[PDB]
């Protein structure tokens, strides 16, 4: 239904920043959403950020508030997060995901392969 490609990730250093994409198939949805979601080893997958189709809707998990931005370039259905002053405790298996709810990850049902960021001290 939805393919999902995301680009951007790697090794990075700690305080440093990198731009993930997610490339999306067809058109955003109207109404449900698009969101970045990270899960490290051993761990739950947990939400980073979401956004409406509009734009104007943003939604950030507490421990990146201020420091990542989502947005979207309607040029295309290309949607990015830019990560800045990056910590150790951000490597993660980051993915994208289409036709959601805010952070809420079991209203998901589209989701990329994930791409590997991983912050060096």
């Known amino acids: 239904q939805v393919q999902l490609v995301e680009s951007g990730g790697g090794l990075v250093q700690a305080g440093g920043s990198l731009r993930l994409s997610c490339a999306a198939s067809?058109?955003?949805?109207?109404?449900?959403?698009m969101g970045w979601f990270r899960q490290a080893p051993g761990k739950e997958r947990e939400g980073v950020a979401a956004?409406?189709?509009?734009?104007?809707?943003?939604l950030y998990a507490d421990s990146v508030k201020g420091r990542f931005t989502i947005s979207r370039d309607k040029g295309k259905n290309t949607v990015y997060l830019q990560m800045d002053s990056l910590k150790p405790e951000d490597t993660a298996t980051y993915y994208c995901?289409?036709?959601?709810?805010?952070?809420?990850?079991?209203?998901?049902?589209?989701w990329g392969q994930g791409t590997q960021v991983t912050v060096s001290s």
């Open positions: 067809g058109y955003p949805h109207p109404y449900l959403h």
């Open positions: 995901a289409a036709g959601g709810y805010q952070l809420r990850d079991r209203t998901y049902g589209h």
């Open positions: 956004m409406d189709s509009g734009g104007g809707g943003t």
